[PDB]
């Protein structure tokens, strides 16, 4: 089962065009698009029942969606503005009024200039000896900075296995400059664990950058989507 | 809130005498301008003010198609409420809804509301935050759960903020320009 949304991350130059596709649950006839901007409440865009529009809400005249004969629907975005950079969710209830099932969501970011897209730089900081000695609980600092736009997912990797315990990833990216963001995450580790030199701690930052289709002028490597990570070994004494 | 646009929806049930009398009336500010009635010979969304008579002729088909659509759903709701409350399978009943958006002088939304009532007793209503509901009895909790699962809150608040205020602008311009 499960509903499918694609693409999950796209970067579009202001005034461009793009399409968002959605595959509802097999058999579901009702589909509806929701737009969620950064922090504000869920906006109702439009809904389609059985290939026909039922109720329209906040869908601008620029966006145009339609359900196909295989019940999937695509959203056509035209003349994109900077205010349009948001998250677009696709929910598909079986019938009208029935329980709906939401989607992963598409991350759309409209940029003022495609040249300003730049991958992050990840740096990993070992804990302070004063902290491990006075507290018996160490923290590893991971600083991803200098990226644009805010399309990152930071994850920790102890001994090659992803963990979610002890992590304190920042809620949102802190934009330092107009075209440069930064993120940080700290990893609580017991001082005995950090003192074992056989343990591998790697902080990994994934960057969803330019699509392959988007052209890029030379003089610099294309900021394609990529995950770069700064690793650090455990050390004793 | 100088200007407000409301809609009164009524689905009086009479069994054995046919099908429920269903009707919608809308009042721009406090004066009725459109009305729909099931117990008309060829029912149609009709204007009730001169400036509304000067509206688009496809507008009436859009609203009439929707009006007959609500009549069907409210026919099922009248049946569903008897199942929720274990009421008599025969006997008159009345569902009424008061939908509206009252806006200030600045055009920003001051309050948006929608209130369901069964036989004069409040059933459910959308909160001031336009995200939550307040059920009134055990059965309205069943309805609240349905709208929470279906996401009806996101749809209704989008109608109250965007659709209802935008069309109040259009109605207000029509009325005051010629009246």
């Amino acid at each position: 089962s499960g509903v499918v949304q694609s693409p999950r991350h796209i970067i579009k130059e202001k005034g461009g065009r793009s399409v968002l596709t959605c595959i509802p649950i097999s058999g579901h006839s009702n589909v509806v698009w929701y737009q969620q901007t950064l922090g504000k409440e869920l906006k109702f865009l439009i809904q389609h029942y059985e290939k026909v529009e039922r109720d329209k809400g906040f869908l601008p005249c620029r966006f145009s969606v339609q359900q196909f004969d295989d019940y999937h629907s695509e959203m056509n975005m035209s003349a994109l503005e900077l205010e349009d950079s948001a998250m677009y969710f696709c929910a598909s209830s079986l019938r009208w009024g029935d329980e709906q099932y939401f989607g992963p969501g598409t991350r759309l970011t409209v940029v003022e200039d495609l040249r300003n897209v730049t991958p992050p730089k990840v740096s990993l900081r070992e804990p302070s000896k004063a902290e491990i000695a006075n507290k018996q609980k160490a923290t590893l600092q991971c600083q991803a900075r200098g990226f644009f736009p805010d399309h990152v997912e930071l994850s920790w990797w102890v001994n090659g296995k992803e963990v979610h315990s002890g992590v304190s990833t920042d809620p949102q990216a802190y934009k330092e400059s107009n075209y440069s963001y930064s993120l940080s995450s700290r990893l609580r580790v017991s001082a005995t664990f950090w003192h074992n030199p056989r343990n591998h701690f790697r902080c990994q930052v994934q960057f969803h950058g330019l699509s392959e289709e988007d052209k890029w002028p030379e003089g610099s490597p294309k900021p394609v989507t990529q995950n770069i990570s700064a690793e650090a070994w455990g050390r004793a004494d | 809130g100088p200007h407000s646009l409301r809609y009164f929806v009524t689905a009086v049930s009479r069994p054995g005498l046919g099908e429920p009398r269903y009707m919608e009336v809308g009042y721009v500010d406090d004066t009725e301008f459109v009305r729909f009635d099931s117990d008309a010979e060829n029912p149609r969304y009709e204007p009730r003010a001169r400036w509304m008579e000067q509206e688009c002729p496809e507008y009436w088909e859009r609203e009439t198609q929707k009006a007959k659509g609500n009549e069907q759903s409210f026919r099922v709701d009248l049946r569903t409420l008897l199942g929720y409350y274990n009421q008599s399978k025969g006997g008159s009943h009345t569902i009424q809804v008061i939908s509206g958006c009252e806006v200030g002088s600045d055009g920003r939304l001051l309050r948006g509301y929608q209130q369901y009532a069964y036989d004069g007793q409040d059933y459910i209503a959308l909160n001031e935050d336009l995200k939550t509901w307040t059920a009134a009895d055990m059965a309205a909790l069943i309805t609240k759960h349905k709208w929470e699962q279906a996401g009806e809150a996101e749809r209704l608040r989008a109608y109250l903020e965007g659709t209802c205020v935008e069309w109040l602008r259009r109605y207000l311009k029509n009325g005051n320009a010629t009246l």
């Binding site: 039922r54 109720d55 009208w96 009024g97 | 809609y7 929806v9 919608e24 809308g26 459109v34 609203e63 929707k66 009006a67 659509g69 609500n70 759903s73 409210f74 099922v76 709701d77 569903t80 809804v97 939908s99 929608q114 369901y116 459910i124 309805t143 349905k146 709208w147 279906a150 009806e152 209704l156 109608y159 659709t163 209802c164 069309w167």
Partner: peptide
């Protein structure tokens, strides 16, 4: 315009 109610 008026809302399009879906059943309860």
């Amino acid at each position: 315009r008026g809302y399009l109610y879906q059943g309860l």
